[PDB]
Amino acid sequence: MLLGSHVSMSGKKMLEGSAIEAHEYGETTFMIYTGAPQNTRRKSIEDLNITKGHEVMEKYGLSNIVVHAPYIINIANTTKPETFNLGVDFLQQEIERTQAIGAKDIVLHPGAHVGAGVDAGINKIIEGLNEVLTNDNNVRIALETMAGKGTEIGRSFEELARIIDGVHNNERLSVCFDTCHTHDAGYNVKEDFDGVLNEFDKIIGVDRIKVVHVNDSKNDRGAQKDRHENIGFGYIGFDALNYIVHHDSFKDIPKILETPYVGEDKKNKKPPYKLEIEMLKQQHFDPELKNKVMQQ
Numbered sequence: 001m002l003l004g005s006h007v008s009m010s011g012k013k014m015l016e017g018s019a020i021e022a023h024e025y026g027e028t029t030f031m032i033y034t035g036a037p038q039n040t041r042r043k044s045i046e047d048l049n050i051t052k053g054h055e056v057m058e059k060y061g062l063s064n065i066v067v068h069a070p071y072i073i074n075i076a077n078t079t080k081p082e083t084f085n086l087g088v089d090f091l092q093q094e095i096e097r098t099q100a101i102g103a104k105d106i107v108l109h110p111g112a113h114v115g116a117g118v119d120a121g122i123n124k125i126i127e128g129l130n131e132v133l134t135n136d137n138n139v140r141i142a143l144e145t146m147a148g149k150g151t152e153i154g155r156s157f158e159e160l161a162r163i164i165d166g167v168h169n170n171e172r173l174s175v176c177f178d179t180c181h182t183h184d185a186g187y188n189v190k191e192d193f194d195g196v197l198n199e200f201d202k203i204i205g206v207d208r209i210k211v212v213h214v215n216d217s218k219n220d221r222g223a224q225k226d227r228h229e230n231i232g233f234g235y236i237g238f239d240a241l242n243y244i245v246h247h248d249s250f251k252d253i254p255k256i257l258e259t260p261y262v263g264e265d266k267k268n269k270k271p272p273y274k275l276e277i278e279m280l281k282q283q284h285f286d287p288e289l290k291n292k293v294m295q296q
């Protein structure tokens with residue numbers, strides 16, 4: 001079972017710390033940002049501490065790890081050229097970092113059209129990806145399914161297919177399927193997950209899903225709000241998320257929790273991943289999970 005979470009990529013230990021943390025939570029894979037998720041500031045490849053990170057991954061049975069690009073990348077931005085240019089430059093550097101880390105995919109939010117409209121934004125993403133994937137290398141960009149909050153592009157499989165169709169080196173594209181995002185966009189992942197996969201197979205191809213993000217939602221189907229919830233405590237629920245986690249279509253695809261920390265206040269937030277993974281491995285919902293996460 002290839003199941004883990006977002007983990008830290010910080011401090012002196014960098015990737016070694018990621019691997020230690022993933023093992024702490026009983027993971028077999030994990031996802032990192034290559035630095036702060038909120039910016040493009042990054043340490044040198046040497047300071048990512050990759051050789052030691054790989055040694056700890058080998059010791060603890062961690063494989064198939066994932067990189068996520070910072071959430072501030074917006075290569076759909078048609079009216080702020082410094083933002084577009086920074087996104088292109090950053091992603092070229094991220095591909096080099098990711099090759100060194102040994103992840104197959106960089107998860108990328110396609111972007112936000114910020115009032116220029118979907119057509120202009122998709123054309124801009126295509127332009128940016130054509131700049132980024134010009135260089136040869138096998139790391140893929142995994143376009144994330146998005147909730148459709150604000151001016152996000154990627155709320156439908158059709159929007160993702162338009163980007164894939166426009167990019168020249170489109171073999172270097174994959175998809176990251178996020179259960180919260182697809183639910184919030186309106187896909188019936190709770191009660192018709194196989195129907196959602198069949199729609200995905202028609203439009204894109206399920207073989208292109210190279211990362212799965214496993215998140216419940218604080219909102220009902222179609223709400224377009226993108227507020228993650230702990231596994232089984234939201235509007236998708238345990239049975240549906242457990243079904244997705246164990247689904248044969250995803251057997252050799254890393255599954256990554258991005259669920260919220262639990263705490264009595266923001267100074268006491270604790271990670272839920274260890275207990276969520278235990279629950280998913282047992283295939284039995286634990287109503288006490290939030291109470292127990294706070295007690296860790």
Ligand SMILES: [Fe+3]
Binds near residue numbers: 068107109
């Ligand atoms: Fe994301």
Ligand SMILES: [Fe+3]
Binds near residue numbers: 144178213258
């Ligand atoms: Fe996600």
Ligand SMILES: [Zn+2]
Binds near residue numbers: 181226
């Ligand atoms: Zn989200």
